[PDB]
């Protein structure tokens, strides 16, 4: 439940927020596969409500468990599973199991939604299905956050044994056609007791797929705790990984300056975070993109945002999400779609870049160069951990990777990077490509020093090489 089942030498999860099955499958094969990447976490693939304009959060009210929606159909999924996972490349479903839809109306297949009568056809769910209807509006009640309506979305009893059932049998579905794991949709809102049983009720990866023998489903739980709530994140972690939501909040908050860079030093679990093992990290999401506040970094705030995704790259803490999102003015707009309402595929520019309205955050190359640092880094701790008291630090993961941030001022030193001596690309500016380096690079003495500079002023206020960039 707390093994990412990633293939070696890969890390990293990424949200292709929306995409669809086909396109997924060519981005493993094309650009996840050869840049080392360890996973792609998919939109929700069951029937969900069909919404007036087709916005991004029609996929959070489920109709059914059909694999029937704008992504694609199941045969288009099992596509996307075989070729994802031939490449190295696993995929964890967002499953959305806390309730039905807020409204009436027809799912994506043409199933049925009755909200009204909490009738749910194609599944089938009935009101005796359901917690009775009261409004979740006290989370210093965790009964209330528990078995009441959020926003009016029906709320499935996972007590009852038909319940657990249903759902046990869509998650087992998904684990047979080859999926390594799931996210769990609004974890909070769900006991942790009922949860544990569902999860147990669970069977080991389909090694046709290319799994180990014995390997578990990775579980990964949304329960937004920023504390002083009845409900909190330790009581998730028994039964698998937690979303670290303070993890984007606190760093959100340091790289936009809110706190100086030298207190990173002991950033972990001291910073009221889980403990590593037991966290997936990320700096946003597809929701706090949208409704996080200030305090979160997007990729509407590039430069800041590309450091955090740097630092939690280059930290050895928790396993590693990127958000990779579509471009929007509106919170509650849809991704790019034609006049029938089907999505429009992200394009890849000559650049490498996605056209279309896709961002495709993870085809940057600090982002990738960060996960190519991640993979060479493999095993290893923060070691020489340097900072001018302010908002200059650096560090390196064991003698296999050196990193160094600069939010204030330029960064001039001559500092240990603990690497063998030589040339290393910087895999932030560049990249080690046809045996030279095409941006910066840095030249490591035999005493494992070098001269680093990272002026305030440039595009990005990182610096990182590692042993897999070296000429
Ligand atoms: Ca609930
Ligand atoms: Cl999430």
Same mark, same amino acid.
């Given at each position: 439940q707390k093994d990412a089942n990633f293939a070696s030498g890969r890390n990293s999860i990424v949200h292709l927020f929306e995409w669809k099955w086909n396109d997924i499958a060519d981005e493993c094969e094309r650009f996840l596969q050869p840049q080392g990447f360890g996973g792609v976490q998919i939109s929700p693939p069951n029937e969900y409500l069909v919404a007036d304009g087709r916005?991004?959060?029609?996929? /959070?009210?489920?109709?059914?468990?059909?694999?029937?929606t704008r992504s694609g159909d199941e045969s288009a999924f099992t596509d996307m599973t075989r070729r994802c996972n031939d490449a190295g490349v696993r995929i964890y479903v967002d499953a959305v199991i806390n309730h039905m839809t807020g409204m009436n109306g027809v799912g994506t297949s043409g199933s049925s939604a009755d909200h009204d009568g909490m009738n749910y056809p194609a599944v089938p769910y009935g009101s005796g299905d359901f917690h009775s209807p009261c409004e979740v509006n006290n989370y210093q009640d965790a009964d209330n956050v528990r078995n009441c309506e959020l926003v009016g979305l029906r709320d499935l009893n996972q007590g009852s044994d038909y319940v657990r059932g249903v759902l046990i049998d869509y998650m087992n579905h998904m684990i047979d056609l080859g999926v390594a794991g799931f996210r769990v949709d609004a974890a909070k809102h769900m006991s942790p007791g009922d949860l544990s049983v569902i999860f147990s009720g669970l069977k080991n990866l389909?090694?046709? /797929?290319?799994f180990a023998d014995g390997a578990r489903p990775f579980i990964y739980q949304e329960v937004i705790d920023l504390g002083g709530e009845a409900i909190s994140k330790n009581e998730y972690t028994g039964f698998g990984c937690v979303l670290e939501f303070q993890f984007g909040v606190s760093l959100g908050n340091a790289f936009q300056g809110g706190n100086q860079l030298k207190n990173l030093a002991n950033w972990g679990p001291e910073w009221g975070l889980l403990e590593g093992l037991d966290a997936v990290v990320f700096v946003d999401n597809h929701d706090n993109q949208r409704t996080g506040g200030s305090q979160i970094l997007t990729y509407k705030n590039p430069k800041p945002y590309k450091m955090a995704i740097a630092f939690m790259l280059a930290h050895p803490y928790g396993t590693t999400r990127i958000m990779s999102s579509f471009d929007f003015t509106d919170n509650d707009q849809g991704p790019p779609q034609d006049g029938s309402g089907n999505l429009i595929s992200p394009g890849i520019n000559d650049d490498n870049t996605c056209s279309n309205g896709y961002v495709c955050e993870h085809r940057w190359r600090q982002v990738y160069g960060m996960v190519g640092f991640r993979n060479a880094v493999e095993g290893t701790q923060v070691e020489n951990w340097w900072s001018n008291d302010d908002n200059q630090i650096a560090f390196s993961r064991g003698s296999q990777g050196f990193v160094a941030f600069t939010n204030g001022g330029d960064l001039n030193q001559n500092l240990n990077?603990?690497?063998?001596?030589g040339t290393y690309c910087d895999v932030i500016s560049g990249e080690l490509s046809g045996g030279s380096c095409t941006g910066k690079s840095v030249t490591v003495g035999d005493n494992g020093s070098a001269d680093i500079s990272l002026g305030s002023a440039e595009d990005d206020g990182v610096l990182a090489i590692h042993v897999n960039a070296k000429l």
């Amino acid at each position: 439940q707390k093994d990412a089942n990633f293939a070696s030498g890969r890390n990293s999860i990424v949200h292709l927020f929306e995409w669809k099955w086909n396109d997924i499958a060519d981005e493993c094969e094309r650009f996840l596969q050869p840049q080392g990447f360890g996973g792609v976490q998919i939109s929700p693939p069951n029937e969900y409500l069909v919404a007036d304009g087709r916005p991004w959060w029609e996929r /959070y009210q489920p109709v059914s468990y059909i694999i029937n929606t704008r992504s694609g159909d199941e045969s288009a999924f099992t596509d996307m599973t075989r070729r994802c996972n031939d490449a190295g490349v696993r995929i964890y479903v967002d499953a959305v199991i806390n309730h039905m839809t807020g409204m009436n109306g027809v799912g994506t297949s043409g199933s049925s939604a009755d909200h009204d009568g909490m009738n749910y056809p194609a599944v089938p769910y009935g009101s005796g299905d359901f917690h009775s209807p009261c409004e979740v509006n006290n989370y210093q009640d965790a009964d209330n956050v528990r078995n009441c309506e959020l926003v009016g979305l029906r709320d499935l009893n996972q007590g009852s044994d038909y319940v657990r059932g249903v759902l046990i049998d869509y998650m087992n579905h998904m684990i047979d056609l080859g999926v390594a794991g799931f996210r769990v949709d609004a974890a909070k809102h769900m006991s942790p007791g009922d949860l544990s049983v569902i999860f147990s009720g669970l069977k080991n990866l389909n090694t046709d /797929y290319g799994f180990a023998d014995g390997a578990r489903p990775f579980i990964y739980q949304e329960v937004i705790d920023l504390g002083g709530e009845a409900i909190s994140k330790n009581e998730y972690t028994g039964f698998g990984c937690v979303l670290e939501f303070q993890f984007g909040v606190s760093l959100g908050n340091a790289f936009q300056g809110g706190n100086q860079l030298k207190n990173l030093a002991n950033w972990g679990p001291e910073w009221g975070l889980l403990e590593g093992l037991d966290a997936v990290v990320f700096v946003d999401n597809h929701d706090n993109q949208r409704t996080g506040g200030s305090q979160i970094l997007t990729y509407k705030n590039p430069k800041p945002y590309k450091m955090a995704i740097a630092f939690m790259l280059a930290h050895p803490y928790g396993t590693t999400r990127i958000m990779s999102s579509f471009d929007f003015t509106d919170n509650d707009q849809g991704p790019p779609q034609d006049g029938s309402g089907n999505l429009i595929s992200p394009g890849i520019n000559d650049d490498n870049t996605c056209s279309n309205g896709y961002v495709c955050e993870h085809r940057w190359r600090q982002v990738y160069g960060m996960v190519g640092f991640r993979n060479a880094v493999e095993g290893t701790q923060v070691e020489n951990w340097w900072s001018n008291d302010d908002n200059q630090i650096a560090f390196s993961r064991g003698s296999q990777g050196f990193v160094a941030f600069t939010n204030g001022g330029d960064l001039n030193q001559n500092l240990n990077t603990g690497l063998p001596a030589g040339t290393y690309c910087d895999v932030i500016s560049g990249e080690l490509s046809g045996g030279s380096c095409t941006g910066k690079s840095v030249t490591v003495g035999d005493n494992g020093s070098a001269d680093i500079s990272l002026g305030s002023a440039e595009d990005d206020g990182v610096l990182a090489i590692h042993v897999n960039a070296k000429l």
